[PDB]
Design a binder for this molecule. Structure first.
Ligand SMILES: CC[N+](CC)(CC)Cc1ccccc1
Ligand SMILES: CC[N+](CC)(CC)Cc1ccccc1
Ligand SMILES: [Mg+2]
Ligand SMILES: [Mg+2]
Ligand SMILES: [Mg+2]
Lengths: 317, 328
């Protein structure tokens, strides 16, 4: 009747941190989004109660104000894309991103103008590398989530390959590069790829752990890693939570074993790499903090559950 | 017949690092110390084989060469203290400590000829050190070193009279007798931390958890020789067996968990300090970085040195399994 969500981040070295502009950033991004009147009534309640501004302000806590605002707009845009969610539709979004100063046709879905004004504002605080990184990764995200949604698992490892692109971590990480100029030889260095990949997988586990209760009550858990593990390893729910707790521990341990062992390029690259890795580590904390403080997964019991870990299995809806 | 030393640092973030000036510091420091002829023949060989310069150079791997040299002198001085304090007890400790402290307070006044040589060894150690240690660092060393000197004498007196300890109370004593607190003062060589930043409760906690891991590591390594000479009475391995009524295998697992809990508290909090702005924030970060590297440095030295495992420590470091020495 109840299951114990493992305390995977109990000793994680990055503490919960909140951007000081949360309140302002929240009120601005909410206004910018909601002036388009583009959410249904059901969606508006979700948008508000999920507080993607909180998610963003936790993730970008140590970043400047205007980037934090971009992060707020990005998280809200993720919702907009979901809510308004094929090749022509995504090509509208990409074309707005590619041409921020181009007037969007009057007979086009409003996501084109929302995407445009988002990027118009973003390029005022994301340097050219961060810009280039976001456009590349965001396109891959859109194709992964939208264009391939129709056609869309052998095992858990093949789920994690697809989910590394559908969760949207990679475009969110581009904002960490706002005032960085990491050359391709640094960003794709094998150790840094490993650290990034381990953080993304930890993000995946955490979100599936927290969405699982609601998803199973509705029969929507087919792609949740909890369910996938149960089927692959022939184990119950409690055994699945232990298995995923172990899997998360191995990832965290690999990160801890390595994140201070990056090689040295000289300055200013070494300081960039250090701050970028700080941003990866804080991302794992921020996602988890938000997953419990938000209404999204636990409604109004999340803070209690974060401390106590026991969750009541919801009955079939 | 054989115990397993827990792989306490398998996941520790700080990698082994060695000061690039190791060989020069080692040679100058060993010559400085050996010219006093303060060691018995057996103690001269041990001083050489243990190579306390390697310990200093691992722990101070990221510090300037001259500060690294001070660290080598300090690690060698601790051995001098261990060798010479053996003649002292609770009745002579204050006059004995005051000889050393008078030397540190006055690094330029040669000591009288009728006084134990540890005064002059301490004096010339400090005469060199004050050229690269700033005033907060100097003040921090003077204060913590004095406490350490009383503590080692008193601890030897308590052992001699079989004063009782359990796990928690042993740890309280050992935090002061291990010598980590004066050693940390060198980390402040070019810092000026205000008293309320240095004594901030989280920084105090981080230092304490660091020191406690250092204690556990050292006792795990020294246990084998200690238990074979019945000298393991105040060895956490023995204190755990007694306090918990468990066997060696059980005690090793208990200590593993105890180390894990300290490591988790340290990792959980090392990036949780409040902010005072610059240059106070950079100092705190670099200070804590030195605390994190000390844990690795102590461990690396404990296995590479001759001090605990002779020439077998690199195998033990890899395999963890150790054959119980028979009674000596
Ligand atoms: C809104 C997207 N997401 C994905 C877990 C909630 C479903 C938050 C998020 C986005 C990007 C990276 C990490 C988390
Ligand atoms: C382990 C090294 N030492 C030196 C006195 C005994 C050999 C204890 C110690 C450990 C850590 C820091 C300072 C001293
Ligand atoms: Mg999920
Ligand atoms: Mg000693
Ligand atoms: Mg010992």
């Amino acid at each position: 009747t109840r299951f114990f969500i493992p305390d995977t981040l109990a000793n994680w070295p990055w503490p919960r941190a909140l951007n000081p502009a949360y309140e302002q950033c929240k009120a601005d991004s909410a206004a910018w989004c909601e002036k388009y009147k583009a959410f249904s009534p059901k969606a508006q309640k979700a948008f508000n109660l999920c507080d993607f501004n909180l998610l963003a302000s936790l993730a970008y806590a140590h970043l400047p104000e205007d980037v934090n605002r971009v992060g707020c707009d990005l998280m809200n845009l993720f919702f907009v894309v979901d809510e308004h969610s094929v090749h022509v539709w995504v090509e509208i979004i990409m074309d707005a991103l590619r041409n921020p100063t181009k007037p969007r046709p009057d007979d086009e879905p409003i996501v084109g103008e929302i995407s445009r004004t988002f990027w118009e504002n973003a390029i005022k605080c994301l340097g050219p590398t961060s810009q280039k990184r976001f456009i590349e990764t965001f396109e891959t995200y859109l194709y992964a989530v939208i264009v391939q949604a129709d056609d869309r698992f052998r095992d858990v490892d093949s789920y994690m390959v697809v989910r590394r692109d559908t969760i949207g971590a990679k475009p969110s990480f581009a904002l960490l590069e706002h005032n960085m100029d990491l050359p391709d030889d640094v960003f794709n260095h094998p150790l840094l790829e490993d650290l990034r990949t381990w953080c993304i997988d930890m993000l995946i586990l955490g979100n599936d752990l927290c969405s699982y209760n609601v998803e199973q009550s509705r029969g929507d858990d087919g792609h949740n890693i909890v369910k996938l593990v149960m089927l692959q390893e022939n184990i119950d729910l409690h055994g699945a939570m232990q298995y995923i707790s172990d899997m998360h521990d191995d990832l965290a341990d690999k990160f801890l074993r390595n994140y201070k062992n990056m090689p040295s390029w000289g300055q200013p690259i070494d300081e960039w790499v250090t701050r970028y890795i700080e941003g990866l580590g804080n991302w794992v904390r921020a996602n988890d903090a938000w997953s419990f403080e938000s209404w999204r997964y636990f409604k109004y019991d999340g803070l209690r559950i974060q401390k106590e870990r026991w969750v009541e299995l919801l009955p079939p809806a």
